[PDB]
Design a protein around this ligand. Structure first.
Ligand SMILES: CCCCCCCCCCCCCCCCCCCC(=O)O[C@H](COC(=O)CCCCCCCCCCCCCC)COP(=O)(O)OCCN
Ligand SMILES: CCCCCCCCCCCCCCCCCCCC(=O)O[C@H](COC(=O)CCCCCCCCCCCCCC)COP(=O)(O)OCCN
Ligand SMILES: CCCCCCCCCCCCO[C@@H]1O[C@H](CO)[C@@H](O[C@H]2O[C@H](CO)[C@@H](O)[C@H](O)[C@H]2O)[C@H](O)[C@H]1O
Ligand SMILES: CCCCCCCCCCCCO[C@@H]1O[C@H](CO)[C@@H](O[C@H]2O[C@H](CO)[C@@H](O)[C@H](O)[C@H]2O)[C@H](O)[C@H]1O
Ligand SMILES: CCCCCCCCCCCCO[C@@H]1O[C@H](CO)[C@@H](O[C@H]2O[C@H](CO)[C@@H](O)[C@H](O)[C@H]2O)[C@H](O)[C@H]1O
Ligand SMILES: CCCCCCCCCCCCO[C@@H]1O[C@H](CO)[C@@H](O[C@H]2O[C@H](CO)[C@@H](O)[C@H](O)[C@H]2O)[C@H](O)[C@H]1O
Ligand SMILES: CCCCCCCCCCCCO[C@@H]1O[C@H](CO)[C@@H](O[C@H]2O[C@H](CO)[C@@H](O)[C@H](O)[C@H]2O)[C@H](O)[C@H]1O
Ligand SMILES: CCCCCCCCCCCCO[C@@H]1O[C@H](CO)[C@@H](O[C@H]2O[C@H](CO)[C@@H](O)[C@H](O)[C@H]2O)[C@H](O)[C@H]1O
Ligand SMILES: CCCCCCCCCCCCO[C@@H]1O[C@H](CO)[C@@H](O[C@H]2O[C@H](CO)[C@@H](O)[C@H](O)[C@H]2O)[C@H](O)[C@H]1O
Ligand SMILES: Cc1cc2nc3c(=O)[nH]c(=O)nc-3n(C[C@H](O)[C@H](O)[C@H](O)COP(=O)(O)O)c2cc1C
Ligand SMILES: Cc1cc2nc3c(=O)[nH]c(=O)nc-3n(C[C@H](O)[C@H](O)[C@H](O)CO)c2cc1C
Ligand code: SF4
Ligand code: SF4
Ligand code: SF4
Ligand code: SF4
Ligand code: FES
Lengths: 71, 477, 112, 213, 189, 194, 305
């Protein structure tokens, strides 16, 4: 149970999706479906944080987090 | 069964159904551009999947649902997407909404659909999810997604599936023609819904002013056993769910409760036909049947209309505007919305395109209420509309809620029988809008207080933890 | 005259009753006893990513951190004004709520 | 200035027009204008005397026995007033009847005794009591004149028998040879006249405010 | 019979419309229905109690001592010594019961009718039971007319009364028409 | 202090009670003489001073009957012989009870009827008062032998006494109590008839 | 501004309702005017014209539109007051009655739909109380063109200035008009049925109890205008309950008060006082006897199933 925010100034997107405990950024983003709605999203060049701190792709996250993808 | 009638209210307006239920269901030539609004349902609004310049086919899933209570939007014809932007909306306001603009190529090529095999064999959850990935939206006016309703139906015990074929509005005859021409598909869809929701019988109900529909339904459904065809009387608030439930079963739906508490589910006939098409053939909801009527239309008819077709093409197909249209509604005269212009598209919830002239419209001059108590004698829910009008006009919405504003279904039986012509339904809609605005503001304030509390708690906990960590570090130094 | 005895007895007993009952804890004044939204805005060039907006916002409105990321708000703004003075370049450009389809209600009839 | 309390006591705060008090004798004894004049004079005298006594005894009152004290220092005083008008003004005594003895529960009087005289000196209490007595007298005179003109035609009548022969110049007859509307003397004729007077007061209040603006 | 006397006091000899007793609080509280109910029950109970205590004081203390002229003082003093007592007790007492009876305290203690009824009762020479029934009859009459007038004024609040007449003038005109309606009961009992 | 919150109430009460006895000792005699001269002025209205020699308000009777109950008959004796009797009558009218007085002689002839108190409608039934109309002086020569019990009613009921325009009651009450008072004088003879 | 639904109507109007009530009244009114003669005609015309003119003046004062004069609400009040008056009455009685009804009873409360009392019966009560001599001198029937009734100018001198099988045939036409009003669904049968039933029941049991005192209530049962009060007067929509149980309570109590004030009271004109008392009692009956909603019990809680 986390949320994901794409911080585009044109259209800010927020979704709320359920994850298995011990998930990382990669599988949460893949299962969340942000990629299919915005195909211009690159997971290795554009930057990923949680709550405003920069986070790596394979790091665990706990409940209530908010993966935020931006420039 | 053995219909109790009563209803405790109801009116008999002029049906005006003889002037359009003669010609068969016509067709449309393919219009150049379609405007599909992204929110054709209740609940949350779907998010777009395709981009500008992409090539799409008939039946491609243009938008996907973000949550459970939503419905995907499918491409009605093959072509190229040109906009993901503002489109006009079928609202009395005239404001725009987020929506896709599809440029029709004209080739009309179907997508490789995922057809089923033996649909009377699988568990109900797979059939419910198949309905979910089809865009079925409940073409009855309520525009509630049929997947959520079927999933809630599977939880409880259902003893009757009710097919709401009693088309009761004046000037509208779409349901009559689809029950006349597509009776076998409606019966097959009713049997599919009876397989989904483990029940006893389907109790398909038609009003008594449709003898051809009753004869066609009886002729199509006579070898199948538990299928029943019922003839409800000719009342205006008869096609409502809570009223047809009382008319058929004899029990009343409890206030603030669903129809599944009475062990019954209500579905419109077009919705049952769409469910049959989606389960048997895999085709999504891309087209419906609408009624073009009124004295200002040259040839009133019932047309098979693709979703997102502009209103002007629908008018131009039906001969043309033979005169000056004083009002141009979208739906029946008792629940219609004043369309702003003719570039408005056709949503899944659009039922009619009435073009009413001057002599079919009553002239009204409001007067003070004389307390004749004709509103109480005609209100189907047994309420007191005059007290609601005095409390809503004095801006006492909390006082008006006690007199039955929570149970109001905006049916329009009040202003139909009012000697001093008072916009009673306008007062009720204004009061309900103000109450909804207050509720939305309170919900936003509660959410924002929870958010700032959570953020302050985590920031304090992080600062205290890092302060204790840096205090422990310097002690070891 | 013995009327004095009865009168002070009535008086002191009613007064004494008030005094003992006090241990258990005008006419007009007793009758009354009986009876614009704001939203912030951040542009696309003026914000250089100083993150002081997120630093001073008790509501979790502005999303984003670090530099040249063009941090943006959400619907959770109240117009409290914590982000105006926080940012040195003064890009926070608080405007009121624009009329859209979901904020459209019905109007009261004029007069009878 | 002490005199502004008197001037404020007629119109800006009236007992029967603003604070809605003392309505019993206002609608009860008003069938003749001389009756209203006599009742207003007696109420004014009682109000002045009890306001003077309460403000003189102001720093002696216990807070939680505050009611039956002042009621007492009303009541005997009113009894003395009754024991005046049963001895020398007996003709006026038979006309008013119960309500001349029913001044001890005239709200306006107790509201004045509690609200005003418990925290102000003797001279403001006397002036305010006289002012609100004069306002009550003017209201009673106006309502009695309207009702008695509607019901019998004549203005101030039996002034010699009631208020002394020296007041004989107040007898004036308007609308001669008139039988009169019997409803105005009756109890339904008092409520309607007071309601019309309150509406007229609100109308001239709005008109005076518009003239000042 | 006592029932005919009770009905005559309630309807034929109402304490407000033909009696002119109690109009100040009655013109002030009757905008709302629930304080009218509470005021009605409080003044009914305390007018019955005051009539009983007034009869006892007159026939056991005042008349055997021979002094009568000090009535319009002893009565109200005892009534004051009654009223505040009960209400100040009910300030602490059950805190639930100070939601329907005790809030309405100083209006009722003057009210002109808690003293108007015992004097008219003394004038005709009632006994103890007859004076108590006279007090509860006057209380029931005041209660009934206040509930009816409160319902009428709450109906008139939402009406379209003109701005020069909305409020207390329409209440006075409505009370006049109510007394005009009540005049039909004259001579019945 | 409960103590003084009490005493206080006490002394007030008493000071108000002593103030109320000196006022009586000035005013009680000055009230009583006004009341008895009001009664004497009422007495002189029905009868002149020629008929009685002794003081009428000195030998008041107290006679009990079966219909009125107790009466307050005042005699008029010239020289040891009854000449007239003056007493009072109660009757319910329209607006309430009416007190009127009769002054009937030793032979049954009415020498005058006057109304002390009544409650009726102004402008409509004030004609019973002798200061406004002559109607109440119709009982000045009648008696129980020249008028049998068919003419002691109003003209609406079939009698010989006129009624005011817009009313049959108040004359019905006045004539009924006058008839009943004459019947009362006839019932107890000697002491009230002689 | 956008328009709101519904976009249909049944062509009903207030003007049709009041004109149909006057049309139902006209059979009895014609037989009343014929059998009393020219002074009744003059009084009826004076009362109706004065009521209409005072309605016009009060509409001009309050700023309301003049089309509110055209619904017939003032003509109906003047009609019922004029047929409720004594026939050979002076003109100032009718003018003062119209002024007390239209005015204090109706227009001072806001207009049509806002008054709490019956205007015509308020005017009739006020005329009876204020002028008892003129309103109790009932004239005798004098039929038109019968060689014993006065002429035109003599009847003018009777009405203006100050120059000094009949009953059963009038109530039958009122009964026919009231029955036709019920059959047109303009009034509800509950109030007349309850009034007549309660009056008849109380009268017949008083007759069976006391045959030498209360036998004069059965034969002259519909005396004082019981039929007119039951059908045309107590069925006023503004000052009657909007429920069915409320209308039954209204009718039963109105009939009880009519019989009580008629027999044991001081007034033979008991109908207006009974009607005024129950227009006073109407709002409590409206507030405490609301009809049951859908899916809810009588107490107002949601149903359980
Ligand atoms: C022989 C002659 C017999 C005469 C008596 C007959 C029996 C009584 C009959 C009374 C008839 C009254 C008829 C009119 C009633 C009022 C009708 C509505 C008028 C109204 O409401 O106007 C509003 C109030 O007027 C005002 O603001 C000014 C009101 C002033 C009232 C003055 C009263 C003085 C005392 C009168 C005592 C006598 C009458 C009572 C017995 C102002 O309108 P607005 O401001 O809302 O609109 C402004 C424009 N938009
Ligand atoms: C005088 C002494 C001698 C006689 C002794 C008897 C005294 C009177 C007794 C009266 C008894 C009253 C109660 C009778 C039972 C009820 C009758 C009415 C039935 C009823 O509800 O029918 C309504 C119509 O009737 C109506 O319209 C009826 C209204 C009340 C009429 C009362 C008289 C009955 C005769 C009626 C015809 C008169 C013709 C005269 C030539 C409704 O029907 P609806 O169509 O409105 O239903 C549409 C609703 N959804
Ligand atoms: C709300 C409903 C009210 C129900 C009321 C129930 C009580 C009314 C019915 C019983 C009436 C008894 O009333 C009986 O009748 C007559 C009317 O002729 C009353 O009245 C008669 O006598 C009294 C006194 O003598 C005077 O008011 C008057 O002379 C006359 O009207 C009497 O007091 C009584 O004898
Ligand atoms: C003024 C124009 C209209 C006049 C006609 C009205 C027609 C409609 C009748 C409505 C009811 C009238 O009320 C009815 O009338 C009759 C006839 O006068 C009245 O009857 C009255 O006069 C008659 C004849 O002198 C006598 O019985 C008695 O003096 C009195 O009762 C009744 O009180 C009542 O039963
Ligand atoms: C539309 C016109 C206005 C209608 C409303 C106003 C009505 C006016 C009524 C005026 C009444 C005057 O009072 C009445 O006048 C008429 C004539 O009018 C007099 O009548 C007298 O003169 C007329 C001719 O003028 C003779 O035919 C008649 O024989 C003679 O009696 C009456 O003796 C008097 O009583
Ligand atoms: C809204 C409608 C109102 C209708 C009002 C109609 C009012 C009519 C009455 C007017 C008042 C009295 O009017 C009249 O006065 C005169 C003298 O003054 C007297 O009448 C005298 O003069 C008239 C001429 O006017 C002669 O025709 C008549 O023969 C003579 O008696 C009567 O008294 C009365 O007929
Ligand atoms: C009822 C509430 C509303 C009141 C509204 C105003 C009512 C209308 C005005 C009432 C006028 C009162 O004034 C009224 O004048 C008439 C004039 O003929 C008098 O009438 C008098 O004169 C005539 C003609 O000379 C005589 O025949 C008559 O016997 C005599 O009474 C009335 O006795 C009086 O009552
Ligand atoms: C809602 C239900 C209906 C209620 C309706 C009310 C109807 C009237 C109530 C009953 C009134 C009858 O009135 C009553 O008449 C009887 C007649 O026996 C009188 O009775 C009198 O005479 C009879 C003989 O005839 C004697 O036996 C009796 O002792 C004596 O009192 C009563 O004094 C009177 O009170
Ligand atoms: C639901 C409604 C209930 C109605 C009330 C029911 C109770 C009624 C009981 C009272 C019964 C009537 O009891 C009695 O009857 C006699 C006839 O014998 C009537 O007769 C009376 O009339 C005159 C007045 O006109 C009185 O002065 C006199 O005392 C008596 O003769 C009275 O009305 C009443 O005194
Ligand atoms: C006022 C009102 C009018 C209605 N009119 C109709 C109607 O004309 N036809 C119909 O099929 N259902 C009508 N309904 C019922 C709903 O529109 C809908 O059929 C039911 O609630 C769910 O059915 P679905 O799942 O097919 O939308 C009405 C309901 C209400 C409250
Ligand atoms: C059936 C019916 C009966 C009516 N009865 C009366 C009546 O008795 N008196 C009256 O003044 N108006 C009557 N009216 C007119 C209307 O109710 C009156 O204008 C209200 O007082 C509006 O204020 C009636 C109207 C109808 C439709
Ligand atoms: S809109 Fe509401 S109150 Fe009016 S008739 Fe329909 S359900 Fe009843
Ligand atoms: S239909 Fe109109 S006039 Fe009749 S009660 Fe309802 S709101 Fe009032
Ligand atoms: S504090 Fe101001 S300038 Fe800095 S990132 Fe936030 S909005 Fe931009
Ligand atoms: S104004 Fe306040 S709530 Fe809104 S974005 Fe700025 S800091 Fe957040
Ligand atoms: S209650 Fe009589 S003066 Fe207030």
């Amino acid at each position: 149970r986390v949320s994901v925010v794409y911080a585009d100034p044109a259209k800010p997107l927020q979704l709320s999706c359920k994850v298995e405990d011990g998930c990382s950024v990669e599988q949460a983003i893949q299962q969340s479906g942000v990629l299919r709605c915005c195909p211009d999203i690159d997971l290795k060049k554009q930057k990923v944080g949680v709550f405003g701190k920069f986070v790596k792709l394979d790091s665990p996250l706990k409940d209530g987090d908010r993966i935020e993808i931006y420039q | 069964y053995f219909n109790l009638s009563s209803i405790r209210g109801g009116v008999h307006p002029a049906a005006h159904k003889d002037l359009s239920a003669a010609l068969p269901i016509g067709s449309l030539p393919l219009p150049p551009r379609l405007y599909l609004p992204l929110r054709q349902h209740a609940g949350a609004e779907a998010l777009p999947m395709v981009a500008v310049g992409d090539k799409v086919l008939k039946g491609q899933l243009l938008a996907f649902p973000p949550t459970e209570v939503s419905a995907p939007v499918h491409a009605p014809t093959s072509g190229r997407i040109v906009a993901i932007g503002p489109v006009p909306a079928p609202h009395p306001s005239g404001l725009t909404t987020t929506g896709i603009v599809l440029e029709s190529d004209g080739e009309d090529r179907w997508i490789d659909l995922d057809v089923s095999t033996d649909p009377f064999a699988e568990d109900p959850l797979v059939l419910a999810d198949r309905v979910a990935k089809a865009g079925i939206v409940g073409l009855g006016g309520a525009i509630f997604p049929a997947a959520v309703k079927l999933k809630q139906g599977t939880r409880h015990e259902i003893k009757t599936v009710l097919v709401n074929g009693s088309e009761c509005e004046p000037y509208l005859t779409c349901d009559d023609r689809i029950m006349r021409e597509r009776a076998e598909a409606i019966v097959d869809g009713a049997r599919l819904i009876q397989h989904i929701l483990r029940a006893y019988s389907v109790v398909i109900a038609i009003e008594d002013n449709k003898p051809e529909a009753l004869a066609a339904m009886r002729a199509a459904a006579e070898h199948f056993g538990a299928i029943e065809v019922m003839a409800v009387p000719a009342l205006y608030p008869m096609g409502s769910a809570k009223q047809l439930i009382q008319a058929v079963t004899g029990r009343e739906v409890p206030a603030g409760g669903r129809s599944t508490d009475v062990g019954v589910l209500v579905h419109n006939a077009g919705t049952v036909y769409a469910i049959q098409q989606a389960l048997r053939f895999g085709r999504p909801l891309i087209s419906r049947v609408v009624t073009v009527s009124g004295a200002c239309v040259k040839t009133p008819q019932n047309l098979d209309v693709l979703i997102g077709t502009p209103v002007q093409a629908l008018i131009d197909a039906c001969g043309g505007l033979s005169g000056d249209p004083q009002q141009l509604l979208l739906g029946g005269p008792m629940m219609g919305a004043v369309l702003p212009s003719t570039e408005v598209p056709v949503i899944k919830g659009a039922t009619g395109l009435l073009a009413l002239a001057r002599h079919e419209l009553p002239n009204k001059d409001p007067a003070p209420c004389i307390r004749c108590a004709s509103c109480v004698d005609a209100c189907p829910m047994g309420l007191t509309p005059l007290d609601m009008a005095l409390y809503a006009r004095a801006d006492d919405y909390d006082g008006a809620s006690e007199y039955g504003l929570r149970d109001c279904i905006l049916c329009g039986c009040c202003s139909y029988v009012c000697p001093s012509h008072i916009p009673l339904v306008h007062y009720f809609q204004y009061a309900k809008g103000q109450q909804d605005e207050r509720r939305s503001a309170a919900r936003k304030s509660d959410y924002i207080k929870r958010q700032t509390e959570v953020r302050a708690a985590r920031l304090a906990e992080e600062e205290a933890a890092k302060a204790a960590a840096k205090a422990a570090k310097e002690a070891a130094k | 005259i013995e009327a004095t005895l009865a009168l002070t007895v009535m008086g002191v007993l009613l007064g004494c009753g008030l005094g003992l009952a006090a241990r258990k804890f005008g006419v007009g004044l007793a009758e009354k006893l009986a009876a614009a939204p704001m939203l912030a805005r951040v542009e696309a060039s003026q914000c250089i990513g100083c993150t002081r907006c997120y630093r001073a916002c008790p509501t979790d409105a502005i999303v984003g951190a670090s530099g040249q990321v063009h941090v943006v708000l959400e619907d959770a703004c109240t117009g409290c004004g914590k982000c105006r003075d926080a940012c040195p370049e003064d890009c926070v450009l608080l405007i009121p709520q624009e009329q859209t389809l979901d904020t459209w209600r019905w109007d009261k009839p004029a007069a009878a | 200035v002490p005199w502004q309390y008197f001037t404020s006591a007629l119109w800006q705060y009236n007992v029967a027009l603003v604070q809605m008090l003392a309505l019993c004798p206002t609608l009860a004894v008003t069938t003749t204008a001389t009756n209203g004049l006599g009742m207003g004079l007696a109420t004014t005298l009682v109000l002045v005397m009890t306001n003077a006594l309460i403000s003189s005894m102001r720093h002696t009152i216990s807070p939680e026995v505050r009611n039956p004290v002042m009621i007492g220092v009303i009541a005997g005083v009113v009894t003395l007033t009754d024991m005046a008008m049963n001895a020398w003004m007996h003709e006026l005594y038979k006309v008013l009847g119960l309500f001349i003895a029913l001044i001890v529960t005239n709200c306006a009087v107790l509201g004045r005794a509690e609200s005003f005289c418990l925290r102000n000196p003797v001279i403001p209490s006397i002036l305010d009591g006289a002012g609100m007595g004069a306002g009550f007298t003017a209201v009673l005179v106006v309502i009695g004149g309207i009702r008695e003109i509607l019901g019998s035609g004549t203005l101030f009548s039996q002034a010699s028998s009631l208020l002394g022969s020296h007041f004989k110049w107040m007898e004036i007859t308007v609308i001669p040879d008139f039988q009169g509307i019997l409803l105005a003397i009756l109890p339904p004729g008092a409520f309607i006249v007071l309601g019309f007077l309150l509406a007229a007061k609100r109308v001239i209040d709005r008109k005076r405010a518009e003239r000042r603006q | 019979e006592y029932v005919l006397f009770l009905l005559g006091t309630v309807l034929v000899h109402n304490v407000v419309l033909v009696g002119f007793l109690g109009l100040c609080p009655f013109m002030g509280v009757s905008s709302k229905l629930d304080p009218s109910i509470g005021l009605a029950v409080a003044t009914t109970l305390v007018m019955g109690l005051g009539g009983a205590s007034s009869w006892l004081l007159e026939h056991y203390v005042l008349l055997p001592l021979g002094i009568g002229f000090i009535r319009i003082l002893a009565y109200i003093v005892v009534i004051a010594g009654m009223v505040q007592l009960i209400e100040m007790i009910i300030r602490k007492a059950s805190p639930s019961l100070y939601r329907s009876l005790g809030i309405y305290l100083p209006l009722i203690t003057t009210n002109c009718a808690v003293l108007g009824v015992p004097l008219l009762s003394v004038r005709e020479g009632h006994d103890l039971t007859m004076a108590v029934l006279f007090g509860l009859g006057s209380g029931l009459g005041f209660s009934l007319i206040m509930i009816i007038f409160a319902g009428l004024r709450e109906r008139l609040a939402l009406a379209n009364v003109p701005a020069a007449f909305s409020g207390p003038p329409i209440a006075f005109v409505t009370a006049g028409l109510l007394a005009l309606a009540f005049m039909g009961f004259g001579g019945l009992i | 202090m409960v103590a003084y919150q009490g005493l206080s109430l006490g002394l007030v009460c008493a000071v108000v009670a002593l103030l109320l006895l000196t006022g009586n000792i000035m005013t009680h005699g000055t009230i009583a003489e006004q009341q008895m001269q009001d009664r004497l002025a009422t007495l002189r209205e029905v009868l002149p001073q020629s008929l009685y020699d002794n003081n009428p308000l000195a030998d008041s009777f107290k006679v009990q009957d079966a219909e009125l109950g107790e009466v307050e008959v005042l005699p008029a004796r010239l020289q040891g012989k009854l000449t007239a009797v003056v007493f009072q009558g109660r009757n319910i009218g329209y607006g309430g009870p009416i007190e009127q007085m009769m002054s009937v002689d030793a032979q049954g002839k009415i020498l005058g009827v006057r109304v002390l108190t009544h409650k009726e409608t102004p402008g409509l039934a004030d004609k019973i008062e002798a200061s406004r109309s002559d109607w109440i002086k119709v009982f000045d020569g009648l008696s129980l032998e020249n008028t049998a019990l068919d003419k002691w009613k109003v003209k609406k009921d079939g009698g010989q006494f006129d009624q005011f325009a817009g009313a049959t009651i108040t004359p019905r009450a006045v004539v009924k109590t006058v008839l009943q008072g004459l019947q009362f004088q006839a019932r107890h003879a000697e002491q009230l008839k002689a | 501004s956008v328009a709101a639904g519904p976009f249909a109507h049944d062509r009903s109007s207030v003007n049709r309702i009041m004109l149909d009530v006057c049309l139902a009244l006209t059979p009895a009114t014609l037989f009343g005017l014929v059998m009393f003669g020219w002074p009744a005609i003059n009084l009826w015309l004076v009362t109706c014209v004065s009521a209409l003119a005072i309605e016009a003046a009060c509409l001009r004062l309050l700023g309301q539109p003049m089309r509110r004069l055209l619904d017939g609400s003032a003509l109906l009040t003047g009609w019922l007051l004029a047929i409720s008056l004594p026939p050979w009455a002076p003109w100032w009685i009718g003018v003062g009655g119209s002024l007390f009804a239209i005015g204090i009873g109706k227009q001072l409360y806001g207009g049509i739909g806002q008054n709490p009392f019956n205007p015509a019966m308020l005017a009739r009560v006020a005329l009876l109380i204020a002028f008892p001599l003129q309103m109790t001198t009932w004239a005798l029937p004098h039929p038109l063109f019968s060689s014993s009734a006065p002429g035109f100018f003599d009847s003018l001198a009777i009405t203006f200035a100050g120059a000094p099988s009949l009953g059963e045939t009038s109530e039958l036409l009122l009964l026919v008009g009231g029955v036709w009003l019920v059959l047109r669904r303009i009034i509800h049968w509950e109030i007349p049925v309850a009034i007549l039933a309660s009056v008849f029941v109380m009268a017949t049991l008083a007759y069976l109890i006391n045959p030498e005192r209360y036998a004069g209530g059965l034969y002259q049962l519909t005396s004082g205008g019981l039929i007119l009060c039951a059908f045309f007067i107590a069925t006023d929509p503004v000052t009657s309950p909007i429920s069915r149980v409320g209308r039954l309570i209204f009718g039963v109590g109105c009939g009880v008060l009519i019989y009580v004030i008629r027999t044991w009271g001081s007034f033979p004109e008991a109908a207006a006082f009974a009607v005024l008392f129950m227009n006073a009692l109407t709002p409590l009956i409206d507030r405490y006897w609301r009809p049951r909603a859908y899916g809810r019990n009588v107490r107002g809680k949601p149903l359980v199933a």
